[PDB]
């Protein structure tokens, strides 16, 4: 704690325009799914959203909730590909306004709602839930309430797709032969300052405590390494504009974050899973 207040430059202070320098046009900010090896980033992001949505067994007329909708790409796929009502919620005002404006332009015969709202305040009954990349922003003290609230707002036949990043235990790493180095440790400290993760077993434990069953987990480890690689290449290609919009310090922090995380997935320290939860 510094005695004098300092309005500093944070990676969280950048505009939508900055993110458009390296995200694909749909502005997905989570692991893509290279269902075909030759897919572009945009095609793999659409394929990731389709992968999650397909696991929900959506039927015409249902209501889908996207917990943590970001810049709206998941809800666009849902509106375009299913005859369903949608609700998207986010804690980001920029993402809220962006998703609202994006989805307002999409023809639809169903209801569409975008809200600046946390899951802890959400009580609407919905038929299915998708949540991609939101869980890693939750504190572990709130995990149980999250799964309990998710269970409660679903019907008897309800299904939830939970997509989130994962870590391994030391024993599993020693088993798998993953050696964590000092530079890895220093990067984890960089994360704790600028930005602990659950293991796959933790997700099973918490979902089951809320009376969900885990029907499926699908791991996308190397898809994330490739997703982060492309993001980093795009940002580097747009370096001059990133520095003009922000600064070399902000550019460097993002580049360090993207390429460090890429290394963690490539090396096998981290993973990312889609959990199909049923009721
Ligand atoms: N407690 C909470 N309740 C609701 N949304 C939350 C939340 N904590 C984080 N979020 C939202 O979760 C999102 C994480 S970013 C992932 C965005 C999108 N699903 C994608 O795949 O690109 C952001 O929109 C963030 O505002
Ligand atoms: Cl900016």
Curated annotation (Swiss-Prot):
Stretches assigned to coiled coil: none
Binding site residues for S-adenosyl-L-methionine: 29-30, 64-72, 90-95, 119-120
UniProt-annotated location(s): Cytoplasm
InterPro entries: CFA/CMAS, CMAS, CMAS_actinobact, SAM-dependent_MTases_sf
Signal sequence interval, chain numbering: none
EC number: 2.1.1.-
Active-site annotation: 261
Keyword vocabulary terms for this entry: Cytoplasm, Lipid metabolism, Methyltransferase, S-adenosyl-L-methionine, Transferase
Enzyme class: transferase
Cross-referenced PANTHER family: CYCLOPROPANE-FATTY-ACYL-PHOSPHOLIPID SYNTHASE (PTHR43667:SF1)
UniProt record similarity statement: Belongs to the CFA/CMAS family.
Identification of the protein by name: S-adenosylmethionine-dependent methyltransferase UmaA
Originating organism: Mycobacterium tuberculosis (strain ATCC 25618 / H37Rv)
Gene behind this protein: umaA
